[model samples]
Target chain A: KVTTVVATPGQGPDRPQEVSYTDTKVIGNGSFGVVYQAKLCDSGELVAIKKVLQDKRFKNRELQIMRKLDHCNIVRLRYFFYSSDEVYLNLVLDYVPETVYRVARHYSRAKQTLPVIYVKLYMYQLFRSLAYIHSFGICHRDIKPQNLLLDPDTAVLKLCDFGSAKQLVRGEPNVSYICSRYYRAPELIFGATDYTSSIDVWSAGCVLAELLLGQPIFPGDSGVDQLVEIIKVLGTPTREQIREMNPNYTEFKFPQIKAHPWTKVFRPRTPPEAIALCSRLLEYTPTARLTPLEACAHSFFDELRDPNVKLPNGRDTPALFNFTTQELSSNPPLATILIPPH
Target chain B: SKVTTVVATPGQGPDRPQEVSYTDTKVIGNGSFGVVYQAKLCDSGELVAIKKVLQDKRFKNRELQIMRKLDHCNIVRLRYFFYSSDEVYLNLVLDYVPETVYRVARHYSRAKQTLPVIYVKLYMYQLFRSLAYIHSFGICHRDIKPQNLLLDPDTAVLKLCDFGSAKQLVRGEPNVSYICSRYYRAPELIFGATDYTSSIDVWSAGCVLAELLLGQPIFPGDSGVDQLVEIIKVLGTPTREQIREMNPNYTEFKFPQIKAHPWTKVFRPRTPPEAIALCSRLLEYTPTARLTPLEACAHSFFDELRDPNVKLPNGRDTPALFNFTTQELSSNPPLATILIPPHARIQ
Candidate 1:
């Protein structure tokens, strides 16, 4: 069972700095600061501490939303402190050894041992992560293999990066940064300035594409060029939906193209279930894209032995104690990924 | 016959002069309200730019009128003018500046150098004076940019122009989003900004300074989302203090938890000291923290400047770009050909 971090005592800024950690190192770099790996000093627990650099331009809402968040799959933020211009953000959460990108590249070489069961487990964990984050009205704007951390032993995946994440609000101009251009949602590409959580839906599809193909679905250099690649892959976003979604869109006009190549990636000869799920997630319109929750309910997970397991509540989920790379490499490719018996 | 325009009736305005002549000499610029052109009086041949506007379009015209009455040199000249049934135009007899300083910037680039700090400091000086005038009048120039800066390469004088989207903000009215160019727009403007104030113009001036120094946009975002990211990346994300300062109503401008932070928390000025000093003020997210135009003009940065000298054809005795016309009985000698009638004063 997965456990959520529990609040110790005082909740305001006056709350004592009781959390502790060890074995910490710089893990990731973002626009505002550097994220580090550490063990809670008081509890001797592994956690991620984000050190935000001093910038007068930093927005506060991003911090406020993160400070107030408490969820199972979502990364736990323990506590945060700010000086005159610097912010010391301490997060009490699970620690992963490496990212999903490393595993994808590694497995491509060690094909002899890679198993399908592990893929199923990884998908399950990732879905749960997406589900939890979405429930909080947040969308992980930039989702790629790099942002997906994996358990060094079990190969379990964890969704990371909330820079571009924004709560879905109707009719409001989305001031959140649209993630790295290549993984941007099709609606974003079509100039949906006032966005919804659907942006995350599209990025999740790109993440899945990277998982299956071992690379980005639409890898382009710049934001504009990235949209071109997305159009080439996903069959240009719907003209009507683009206008309907973002009323403030004043950017790109409808780009007319004949076909996209990534659409051909799926094996026509392969069962229809794989193609269907890929298509659903990678749909052209964000609103029409398969949401993380909807993706969780995809028939692909129909055959799980017990799909109803609830992650533990209160306090951060400790790193998996029983995870080992050995069992994961040789397990049989499971057939539960399909809807019914194909 | 169709009346093309309308004029302010006699005794309609206390500040207006009688029988001001308007002649369409050359087109100056255009805006949402109507077109602007350089005009010369037929009898006296005094040079002026007449903003020929429609009668009903008071937004830009009223803004110009309000801006014209100010006694600042950095601001454009507002001479005697009258409206008629044919057009509602203001005869702003300005010191015609021949070139945009940015064009002169190309020469600096050729020398493998940026516009000298003095140029920016000088521009900032004019910007400060103009801003002081604008804020004093309780109006905001929502659109402030390099293109709106009419300059005279010959004299190095500057004038802040374009008030089409200006709002006459009274004290206590909420902040609004009649912002400038998208590239220079503030974060609040991007996130449903509204009921704003003179601070908006200050932010635009800061953007202008950055553009002048960097020779390009500081935050170049193709879309609103990308723009926010550019800001976040450079400034790190905004904090509570900064947000509440610029926007008293934070909850309205607030967004949900984003996937990642916008900037790399540590934001240092990307240019030299002079550029950074000016940029720091403009780039500030908090509108309240902005430096006023007058305060900026008096900064140590502009301390090295001479008292508004200009380089006319006959040598140094000329009007600087931002200088206005003063009623001097003994006029300075003419440097160029005054092709107008002998009664016309070219000096």
Candidate 2:
């Protein structure tokens, strides 16, 4: 329960030996950074800190955006303390429990999609955060479940990783195509030269779908193949439509194919209203895609979603996190009890 | 269609050109106003393009009265003109410009408009100056196209034609929702915006300039949806801040995630101070920062322009100027003038 702050090795020159989080335990790991659960070594506050790897080549703007975030929905940047070893940036904020993403699988007997209520709540939080970012003229070019941290108990989502963030300036073309492949927008499929923030929204749509489906939406092996899988499910558009919509698409041609009607793969059976809304959100073209904020206010959520669903009392138990790792040793994720009774 | 047979000059030009009947003329081209034709004038044996105002009879007099009063070299010249029973026909007997602009694109079907390098420069400059003059008169040419221009194939003497869609500024709030084409529509227009200005023409000029160079459209989106995406792609997707920055009024508008889709992953330059700077001034989704015709002409993008006087007989030019001009203007006299009816001047 230590909240006292202390210096974590790898902070840069301006490093003050003053207040810092008490080092706790390792939570997650990736190529560019290592995330840890720690408490402010000084204030007795719990937080998460991800230190950028100095060995791997990284970008400057990528770091600045992470350092400059001040929105409430966004994780806070407490201090960028300098050290003799590496550039130590101190992030002071709430420690969101990874109940849904990491622990959800262990608890569920089978890989059933989380409750639609949980998904809707996540969608609402995700969209609200995005609206704040867009309002600040910033695009979180990369959005995926990994970047979303679930609230310890309420499951209220918080988005992370502004590493690929870009400030939208008018009349400029976005060259870099970034974001997880599973959630990549259609425009990126053909190597579109100029793309926009709709890319992130499209990814968010995919993430929402993944939550609803309980698995990846277009789960192809490669980026190109993944796109094809998505097209197959959503149905491919005519060359004429593509050409008419994209005049600057001289570089990458939309793969030629027999035009098929869009009704073949419409799969959202349980929630018809949600299916209709999601269908529009996942339009083939980025321009016609939907934003997360819009989805929150959609009529689809009118009946199913209650703004006070998990508000105020926050009294409910975490429904999707009832498993223990000792039981999921075989898959380290899948539990044998998940087998169907039949 | 006969060439070099008739000449009609509007205003006080001494050129007494003969009238070419709408029925006797061949339809050269058609736009928002009316159909154009190349009819031989019985008197001078000079071929002239005739713009016959189409029936709607409501807005004709307003257009005719405006054209009759103003005289600017950069503006389109009005030569001899007359009227028919149902439609008032105007004969624009003027110097025949180039008929067809040759494609200088080597092998790969390069884009159109490869003129003598000099004329291209002069034409663009004159076009800007002409637009400047038009704007000075507090009139906005809602529609501007190459077909409306008359050029001397040899001198590349360029002048604006077609005033059918032109309008003198009114002193009140603008609540109209008219658009020429999806690709040419500005951001404000796309959003059902009101109280616009010459920025619309500036956007059109940007499109024309790009078309002249790329031999294609800059924002070639065909549908309103695609067009919005294309715009955002070129000019990064507008964030709530940027949108509100341009017009605080936009803050009142509802912008949910799904609705602002096209702007989501808009293409942004890695880093281009010049191209970015020029484009930034031109493509403000909000009209507040949009560049005027004058500002665009002064942009550094055109700084390397060769002298307009230096002509390049490069593009495949033929003596087919009269035929093309006649065909393009045939609709103006009939459709453009008669559509509004000369009596409907906003008095």
Candidate 3:
């Protein structure tokens, strides 16, 4: 059965036009809402319909940010509409069939390590999406392997699930208790509400580490347990590092522990460049962490800079170096290194 | 002499603030809003026009809001914006398109030659595409003039700019009738109709087309009433029924009855019949009688744009005309079919 509604595109003016979709089936569901797989009647293209219950009091932050975002690495919000009673807000998004979480789990289940090339391809794109969204002051608070949608055939990655995303304004206090448990930044655990978009960088760092290790680097069961898990690896944060993360935290009586070496954190076979990049991303001081654009320029991603580098399946790599002026506007000096010669 | 760097936010994403530096600034244009400066961005080493307008913090800048939402090839892109202290100057960093349709057409007029028909079709088709994209969102670009149409000399790409007067026209809401430029103002606006639709822009596009064919403004009137007189001199006086359709309350309708001028006589001798026909269709008295922007795109006059074998005079392919996004194709399926010829359609 085909259903039609007059809806406006997520990125343009509110020029309402008829959009029709058919062959609806439940794809996934969660505490946030239900998602359905549907086929667009006009173009016969597959789309994911994310229907969330609208709270009349506050505006939907995800819908607000998704409407403004337009990037290749980010999931596209094709169109959106609401129920007449305003109870349900349906976000029609681009349907990407696979996710990094599923793809990684397939290798784990089959007892085969994820190819180093695929790991590089996935994390590089994740950093690209983070850079694009971070440039907009948006923090995708719930970044993890599950949120990264993938296309197996094309090997393209699109960042999705902006339900926890927020535009982090400077000088304004935000909810420190954000992001998923394993990928949450240290500042968030310290109850720092004034976190910047750099929190996303920390989460991205965790994703990179997880892909390299084939499991979450910091698998914490509780909030306190989360900090203990981090301290077990990075050791105790110094007074200066703690102050930089949250100025309100005055307690610094933790037992003195030496910092761990980055080389020992991952498998010995892991590239030193990859370990070097992860060290920069997972810093105790939030400001000390590398920005997403800087992370992309790291030597870890230098293999992607090569023109001859192809996917493990012998297909051409995704358009990794096609940095738009907008993307380069954040860190202009990195433009030269971010893009390599022909 | 010195480069100025400011923590600027993106036009689309207001929260994402970054540093933007520019130098070699010189005054380009100044109007009631503020001054426009031509400058080069230090980072990208690209030329850009910075329109700086004094801000009134209490009210929202409609132009900035509109420009942020617009992302189309035919429309100008707003790269970044920033606010300065005291006066709160809004620096709109936009693509630096050096030529305008007015100046380019004037160059042809000075040489005593009409702009080539292929260029006319290419330019007008792109303009309509821009209109179609914007009008879909209920935005009426109240200002549509040759000077506002930015052109790239080499590629012949036309981009619509200057949204200072554009408004999202809701059906019942009234807007100012004394808008748009004198020569390009629609008849309904001339009749003091504030409840006009986006069709006003269609009329303005028609004027641009006719001017390109004639090498001069078709109805170059001196004032508001004089403009109507010029239109009546050719299209004849608006009938009482037509006047009612424009504005039912427009009472003082007395006018000299002049037979409509022949469309063929309105332009140069060698102007194509399709061009004249399209002009006649666009310059209609009734607002609804005018062709919609997409319909204008599918007009016989623009069939050359749809031809698979058609190439620019420079042997370069035409600027992406048929690559309609989902937003564009949502308007009408039948019109989209006509817009994209059979051979161009993918399975």
Candidate 4:
């Protein structure tokens, strides 16, 4: 027997229509919610239904944000229904089979380097998605390998898990305690609630470094220790950088450490362009980090812009230069470099 | 040289407000929601519409929040939003679409000619797609009249705009039933059902479709009471069960009985049977009985849209109708398969 409910679509008009599904089973659960895998009876397509307790006092921000976001590089929120019991908000999403976290782990476990082209393809798409959201004033908040969904055959990457996502408003305070430990931005660690979406850029940089190094670049044990790990490579942030991060956090002085060379940070065979891009992204100053679009235009991703490039599986590469007018409008100068001539 | 620059936050990304300069600002539209102005961006030299509404700092603006989250080809894109000192006016910079569905439809009506069935199909298909996208998020446009549907006349692309009355419907929460325009108000809304679902929008869409077909409003009512009378004149008196489905609280059922005006007779003799069939399903008294936005998209009336050979009257390929995202296709795969023609499928 199939179960059906008059559910509303996650994005468009509010027509509550019947959605039937079968083969429901719990696939995952966390502090935020429980995720179930089910097959839709009408189309035989698999979907992941994420059930979270709705706080009646406030509208679910994640639900609101997911409903508005329409990007090929981001996870798709399909239908959402509210259950009466304790007011659960169930988000039905496309059930992508693989994640970049699992895929990268596979390569690491096999003691093999992730092909550089795959890194370029994945990171390029990630930056493209990041630029799109950043232009909208939304910060994914959490940007790590775990949140990147992958379709293995196609090598298409979709950003997921907006639980930590927020539309950061200037002069407004946000919880500084966010993101996974290793990927946490220095500003967040320094207790800066006025942090911009640059925290996501920092986290993305860490992910890129991890893929290249086969291990977390910072690998901090605790909040205090996380800063120490960052200091080890990038050296201690200058007092000026500290003020830029948080004016409230300039009370103490840490032992000065010399900055490590970018060339020595990654393995010997790592491309110079990759290291250069990482240097630009993993800056100590929040604003010093490259914007998502700038990262997309970095020489590291030049291979993606080349028309001759193909996926590692020999499949035609996913369309990379299909920049919408809205995306290009943010920075006009970069259009020439970001998009190659037909 | 009368350029106004405001530090505005981007609609989609992180909260870093950058200075945006615009000139040649003038009022384009206004309502209780606030004033909309047509402006030109200094940097890009592109025209943009800025909807400035008063904001109360005590509580977050729902329209701004909702507009920031939405991004679709069939919906107006909110480029940037900023606040001002005099009043916390939320200045929403959106794409400038020069024409509206209301004006376009009126142009055809004024000429005493019906909107070509092909254009009707194109407009309604896009509207359904927009509805499907918003309904997925549980956002009821509340007002789905043609005035809110913006159009790029050159490309014939329709974008759903005006989110002032839109709200994310949470089950069990009471919402104002006094929503939507008079002609397009769903029967359940007229019944004062605070617990109405998104089906109300489907009904309004049905009204829009019928208006394009009839070259005027299908239900031209003077008031709420008159609106119901007009609807009854067409669909006949609602049954006791139908009244209960709309609003269980209403116990009075003293209206005179009238047989439903035949669907075929309600329109011109040349109206397509499929179009008439779709209208009947949408205009049903019971909200749940209405065809969903996706279901309406797959209706036989839109079968031409799914045909590979079909092109717009301008000899251009139709707007990206079949680019159904996984989210849009997630509701019903079988229907999505039918909605997307064989040629549009991924190989």
lDDT of each: 0.56, 0.53, 0.82, 0.83
Q: Work out the iRMS of candidate 4.
A: 26.4
Interface RMSD of each: 10.7, 17.6, 31.2, 26.4
Worst 10 residues of 3 chain A by lDDT: A248-257
TM-score to true structure, per model: 0.46, 0.41, 0.50, 0.50
- Write down the C-alpha DockQ for each prediction: 0.04, 0.02, 0.01, 0.01
Candidate 3 yields a Cα-based lDDT of: 0.82
Instruction: Score candidate 1 by lDDT.
Output: 0.56
TM-score of chain A of 2: 0.74
lDDT of 3 by residue, B101-168 (tens): 99999999999988999999999999999999999899999888898899997888999999977899
CAPRI quality level assigned to candidate 1 from its DockQ score: incorrect
For A1-342, candidate 1 gives per-residue lDDT tens digits of 222233332234646544544566777655445677766656666767666533344555555566655444445555555533344443334666777678778876775323334444566566666655666676667766677777755445667656556777666665443655456665554334566776766777776666565456676433344555565565555546556554444243333444654437743343244456677887755567775655655665443434343223322323222212321222212223322232
The full ranking of all candidates by lDDT, starting with the best, is 4, 3, 1, 2
Residue-wise C-alpha lDDT for candidate 4, range A179-230, written one tens digit per residue: 7667878877664658899999999999999889998888733344456668
The candidate with the higher lDDT, 1 or 2, is: 1
Task: List residue ranges in candidate 2 displaced over 4 A.
Answer: A1-17, A53-63, A85-93, A103-109, A240-269, A303-342, B1-347
- Backbone clash tally for model 3? 2
Candidate 2 achieves a global lDDT of: 0.53
